[PDB]
Nucleic acid binder design. Structure first.
Ligand SMILES: [Zn+2]
Ligand SMILES: [Zn+2]
Ligand SMILES: [Zn+2]
Length: 88
DNA sequence: GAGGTGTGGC
DNA sequence: GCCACACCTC
């Protein structure tokens, strides 16, 4: 009646709290990657949606994160964070 | 730079 | 489910 979301694969008894995390984990067993990049010529596929959204910034040149000292811009927040270490 | 992924807010 | 942070790995 009330229980955690479990992976019913024989060799996997792992569990998750969010249903979305289990659905993503199942794709590691089947190898499915339903999130396709429609950019003509790319062909990349991903198991989750967020790496595709992130990947897409490569094509669009979207770089919201900018260093306010040297003016260099990045497409990801983790890239800016690492860059800031250069200004310590 | 970039993908892969654990985790969480909405 | 979507999106994003943060960390890992190459
Ligand atoms: Zn599993
Ligand atoms: Zn692409
Ligand atoms: Zn800078």
């Amino acid at each position: 009646r009330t229980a955690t979301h479990t992976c019913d694969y024989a060799g996997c008894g792992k569990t998750y709290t969010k249903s979305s995390h289990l659905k993503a984990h199942l794709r590691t067993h089947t190898g499915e990657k339903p999130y396709h990049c429609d950019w003509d010529g790319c062909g990349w596929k991903f198991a989750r949606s967020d790496p595709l959204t992130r990947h897409y910034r490569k094509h669009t040149g979207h770089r919201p994160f900018q260093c306010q000292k040297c003016d260099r811009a990045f497409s990801r927040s983790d890239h800016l964070a690492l860059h800031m270490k250069r200004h310590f």
